[PDB]
From a paper:
To further confirm that chain-length selectivity is determined by the FABP3 structure, five SFAs (C10:0–C18:0) with higher affinity were cocrystallized with the protein and analyzed by X-ray diffraction at cryogenic temperature, which resulted in their crystal structures with ultrahigh resolution. As reported by Sacchettini’s group, these SFAs were firmly held at their carboxyl moieties by cationic residues. The side chains of two highly conserved hydrophobic amino acids (Phe16 and Ala75) closely interacted with FA molecules in the C7–C9 segment, responsible for the higher affinity for FAs longer than C8. In contrast to the structures of proteins that possess a flexible binding pocket to accommodate a wide variety of ligands such as cytochrome P450 and nuclear hormone receptors, those of the FABP3 cavity incorporating different SFAs were virtually identical with the main chain RMSD of 0.13 Å and the conformations of the C1–C10 portion of the FAs were also very similar. The water molecules in Cluster 1, which were highly ordered, formed a stable hydrogen-bonding network that was virtually identical in all five FA/FABP3 complexes. On the other hand, Cluster 2 was confined to an unstable (high-energy) hydrophobic area surrounded by nonpolar amino acids and the FA hydrocarbon chain; a significant desolvation energy release was expected from the displacement of water molecules with an alkyl chain. It should be noted that the C18:0 chain almost exactly followed the high-energy hydration sites. The lower affinity of the C20–C24 SFAs could be accounted for by the highly ordered water molecules, which contact with C18 FA at the top part of Cluster 1. Further elongation of the FA tail should disrupt the stable water network, thus destabilizing the binding of longer FAs. Formation of this network is effected by the carboxylate at the FA head group, suggesting that a U-shaped FA in the binding pocket of FABP3, in which the tail comes close to the head, is the ultimate design for defining the preferred length of FA chains.
Residue numbers in the entry: 0 to 132
Write the structure that this text describes.
């Protein structure tokens, strides 16, 4: 049900990522490098386990999860969170919880592009990824 999300994706547009990072308490120097970084996101499946890799010249991350089953995660900015990823309205919705805080990472396909919407506090960031062959 997730299959159109699978593959290798490259960042091609970013709006309000600094706002999002600052809301999370990321320091200025990290925000500065991150603002010029273009990650590659690789989404693969093996049975109902999904692996999501984010690779860049700055930070790399990898998570594996079953849809609808909570997992522990340590984010790129070193938050230790309780996470769950589900399909909702055809969107891949990743909710992270820690210290009573929450943030959502929502992925939706629009005209073949992967749109990642990141919300924390009032900050709303929209990052667009395009498929690599
Ligand atoms: C792994 C590369 C992530 C993007 C560059 C480094 C950012 C580090 C500080 C902010 C981390 C916030 C949580 C992760 C944001 C992921 C954004 C994305 O996948 O495009």
């Amino acid at each position: 049900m997730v299959d159109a999300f699978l593959g290798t994706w490259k960042l091609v547009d970013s709006k309000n990522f600094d706002d999002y990072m600052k809301s999370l308490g990321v320091g200025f120097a990290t925000r500065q490098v991150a603002s010029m970084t273009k990650p590659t996101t690789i989404i693969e499946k093996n049975g109902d386990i999904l692996t999501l890799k984010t690779h860049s010249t700055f930070k790399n991350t990898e998570i594996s999860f079953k849809l609808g089953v909570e997992f522990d995660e340590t984010t790129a900015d070193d938050r230790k969170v309780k996470s769950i990823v589900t399909l909702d309205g055809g969107k891949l919705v990743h909710l992270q919880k820690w210290d009573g805080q929450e943030t959502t990472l929502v992925r939706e396909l629009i005209d073949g592009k992967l749109i990642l919407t990141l919300t924390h506090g009032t900050a709303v960031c929209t990052r667009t990824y395009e498929k690599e062959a």
